[PDB]
Write a protein that binds this ligand. Structure first.
Ligand SMILES: Nc1ncnc2c1ncn2[C@H]1C[C@H](O)[C@@H](COP(=O)(O)OP(=O)(O)OP(=O)(O)O)O1
Ligand SMILES: [Ca+2]
Ligand code: NA
Length: 430
DNA sequence: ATTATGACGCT
DNA sequence: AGCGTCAT
């Protein structure tokens, strides 16, 4: 009743760039704009592996993880941009730098949590309160929400997409009580107005388009963002949750896309998020653990409390390379040469990071995979990172892994290594 | 022969 | 610590 929390205390948005690496390449090369195109890494093996796909190319069935040679079978006119290669490996610097451009703009509007290279959460609770004060009971015009969808509308008693969007928006605005500064639906709407402004600023100042979700927590905001892509934003209200969740496969909710989600489905014999409401909190904790059970109990009701953490910079800086099949490293010289290549890229990134961000990494983590192991990482060891020097880092990395060598011969390496990974961690202010 | 990342949970 | 899960 009156004491039942409804998880409507915050306004949270998730902003996510559309086909990000493709946009970065299209900005740089106008010949790729408005074309089916994709970004690929490496080229020798099957034309390279696709890592990003324009919406025009998606229409042909082109997807991430596809080999470009195979993508060309679906889309003969597909255009390709290659990830830069430095020191024998893919170098993602251009995309990281583009990400900083966007994150810096978002940070003008509110505190952000960097969630990935091209997405960030925003806690808009305070900004909304402020904007509500300026508005002073004044209604919100549809003109302020030119790219916003209201999930679940229109409903009740045009055949074009944009017509539908406007009908839903009108029904929503018609029902708003702008007289109540504490109305959660009103707070969400003002949140959406701010996100329109943020998205406009990103596009004006970078050229990049994005989508966004606006809701009361991170999980719903993330789910919302994907409902209308590309170049649109979606508002998911508390009230929209029962219908939305009633046919929402469990795997669509962030964190349920893997083994836990599969177990929820198997153990409970359900398919959709909404079906979770029929279990008690203790029942859910019994199957999935205290933490997961409480989380599920609240989440299936649209409630989640994970905060938007104030963190704009990555917490680790890493460099990794696979050596698949016949390329696996089988000699000590090979292993040392590649550790050096990685260490050199890492040094470059670390030095730039120290200058830009006034911090220093203090731990170096070294990870490898051995041929045969189904696991992505086979072994992880740490050592001290006391100097930003690639030769030292690579020597140190070799020292911590060298005993993994089964080979009786000093010069040979067995079993061959199929992955090397160096990661700088544990930053301290400097 | 997906690859290159990056955050967080468990013990 | 070192490993696993989940994600982009
Ligand atoms: N599995 C991956 N391997 C390598 N790079 C990836 C992978 N997934 C995503 N990326 C990179 C390239 C993407 O452009 C960027 C952002 O990813 P993501 O948001 O999932 O898709 P996207 O921005 O390309 O398309 P969308 O418009 O669907 O969001 O990160
Ligand atoms: Ca994206
Ligand atoms: Na993303």
């Amino acid at each position: 009743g009156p004491h039942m929390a409804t998880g409507q205390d915050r306004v949270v948005a998730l902003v996510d760039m559309d086909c990000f690496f493709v946009q970065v390449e299209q900005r740089q090369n106008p010949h790729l704009r408005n074309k089916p195109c994709a970004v690929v890494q490496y080229k020798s093996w099957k034309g390279g592996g696709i890592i990003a796909v324009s919406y025009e190319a998606r229409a042909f069935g082109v997807t991430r993880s596809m080999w470009a040679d195979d993508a060309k079978k679906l889309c003969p006119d597909l255009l390709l941009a290659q990830v830069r290669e430095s020191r024998g490996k893919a170098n993602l610097t251009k995309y990281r730098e583009a990400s900083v451009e966007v994150m810096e703009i978002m940070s003008r509007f509110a505190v952000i949590e960097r969630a990935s290279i091209d997405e960030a959460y925003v806690d808009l609770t305070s900004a909304v309160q402020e904007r509500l004060q300026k508005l002073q009971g004044q209604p919100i015009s549809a003109d302020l929400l030119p790219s916003t969808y209201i999930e679940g509308l229109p409903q009740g008693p045009t055949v074009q997409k944009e017509g539908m969007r406007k009908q839903g928006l009108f029904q929503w605005l018609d029902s708003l009580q702008i007289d109540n500064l504490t109305s959660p639906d009103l707070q969400l709407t003002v949140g959406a107005v701010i996100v329109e402004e943020m998205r406009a600023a990103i596009e004006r100042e970078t050229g990049f388009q994005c989508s966004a979700g606006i809701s009361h927590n991170k999980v719903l905001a993330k789910l919302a963002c994907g409902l209308n892509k590309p170049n649109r934003q979606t508002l998911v209200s508390h009230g929209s949750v029962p219908q939305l969740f009633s046919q929402m496969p469990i795997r669509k909710i962030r964190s349920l896309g893997g083994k836990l989600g599969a177990s929820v489905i198997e153990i409970l014999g359900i398919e959709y998020m909404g079906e979770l409401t029929q279990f008690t909190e203790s029942q859910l904790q019994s199957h999935f653990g205290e933490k997961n059970g409480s989380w599920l109990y609240a989440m299936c009701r649209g409630i989640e409390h994970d905060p938007v953490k104030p963190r704009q910079l990555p917490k680790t800086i890493g460099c990794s390379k696979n050596f698949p099949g016949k390329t696996a490293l089988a000699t000590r010289e090979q292993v040392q040469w590649w550790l050096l290549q990685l260490a050199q890229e890492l040094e470059e990134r670390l030095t730039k990071d120290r200058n830009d961000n006034d911090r220093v990494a203090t731990q170096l983590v070294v990870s490898i995979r051995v041929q045969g192991d189904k696991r992505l990482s086979s072994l992880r060891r740490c050592c001290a990172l006391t100097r930003y020097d690639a030769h030292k880092m690579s020597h140190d990395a070799f020292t911590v892994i060298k005993n993994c060598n089964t080979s009786g011969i000093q010069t040979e390496w067995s079993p061959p290594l199929t992955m090397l990974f160096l990661c700088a961690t544990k930053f301290s202010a400097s």
